[PDB]
Structure formats: C-alpha cells, structure tokens
C-alpha cells in the first residue's frame, strides 16, 4: 500500500508538470493541439512542427 | 502497578507531543483541518496536501 501511495504520488506529479508545461496560452506539449506553424519566409510560408504530447 | 503507571504517563506525554505539532500556528499532524492546499501556477491551481491524524 505505501508503494501505491508513492505511485499515486508520482503519476499526479507527471500530470500536473504535463499540464504546466505552457509558453504564452501555447503549448506543443501537453496535447491542446495537432500542431504548431511558425513563420519561415516573408512569402508566409511556415515551419511546421508537430506536437509531442507529454 | 508501576508498569501502568509508566505507560500512562507515556499516554499523557504522546498526547502532549501530538498537540504541540504546529507550525505558526498551522499544522497537519493533529488533524484541525482537512487538507491544506499549495501553489501550483501563476492560475492559482492547487496543491492539495489531505492531512493525516496522528
């Protein structure tokens, strides 16, 4: 029962450091999204980058 | 009847050690509250700590 306490404890530590894990309103991390697009060119065309949910 | 004795007076010394528990005045070892919750996040997201009575 204490190492079920202490799993318990660690798996609510991994979500809430998951659900931190934010950069102004965005995140690429915690699953709020598909993907992020970042500008690349002056044309508009972008980086694309997909999320790695955590 | 001196064993009892002895073990009463360890009874009223645990009690005493119990109560004194505290830490500016807050405490979660004899169980006056619930929980006591804890920063998390700029939100105000919690940190829920259940006390434990002892």
Same mark, same amino acid.
């Given at each position: 029962?204490?190492?079920?306490?202490?799993?318990?404890?660690?798996?609510?530590?991994?979500?809430?450091?998951? #659900?931190?894990?934010? &950069?102004?309103?965005? %995140?690429?991390?915690? $699953?709020? =999204? #598909?993907?992020?697009? &970042?500008?690349?060119? %002056?044309?508009?065309? $972008?980086? =694309?980058?997909?999320?790695?949910?955590?």
């Amino acid at each position: 029962n204490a190492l079920k306490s202490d799993f318990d404890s660690l798996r609510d530590q991994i979500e809430k450091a998951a #659900t931190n894990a934010k &950069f102004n309103g965005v %995140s690429i991390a915690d $699953g709020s =999204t #598909t993907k992020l697009t &970042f500008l690349a060119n %002056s044309d508009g065309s $972008g980086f =694309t980058v997909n999320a790695k949910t955590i």
